[PDB]
Amino acid sequence: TVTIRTRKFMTNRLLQRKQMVIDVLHPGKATVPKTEIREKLAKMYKTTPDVIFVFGFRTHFGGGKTTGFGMIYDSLDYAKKNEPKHRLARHGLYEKKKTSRKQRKERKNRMKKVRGTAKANVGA
Template structure:
């Protein structure tokens, strides 16, 4: 752990999305930046939760260094996090793996979907899994 300190402001409890959201001001004199894992651990300790439900993103370093500002989200449960967080942020935590489709599969699916109209496209798109 480094000598970085975290201050939170604009704290808000979002009951619809089952989370607490805040802006995090990070003071780190003498350091270029602090890793997101470290920030997650410190926020988790501050709010007495496990680090797996803490999501931090959007950190920008101020000119001259020593201070960074970003966003922090703390979900009530891991299931809520998986439900509401974007897939790319879940991927950063290792909670989501994107299915790789080959180029040929994508093209075949596209051409199958061109043959039907309207709501039937959804059924044709699902037919890929054989």
């Protein structure tokens, strides 16, 4: 029903990863979510679906062909090594602290209102 064809396949072996350009062909249906896209891409490359970080999917006028990117690693530690943090957050591998930068700005100002070890307890 929905097929994937490889395009611009290049193997930058030093990054322990391979890059390829994703186009998704599907007639008369909605935009396909990335989960079974990752599953079918992993089944095509004989890999378990855990080292794939796809992003940037745009839909053409008509929706018969949607473009995208395709990414595969070789190991989970290498995927943890050189990867943007937001892709890990989308995959649920890295979490960030939830305060805004404004609160951190007045926090840093409240530490710099004093000197010494008083910075440890003026900003809680």
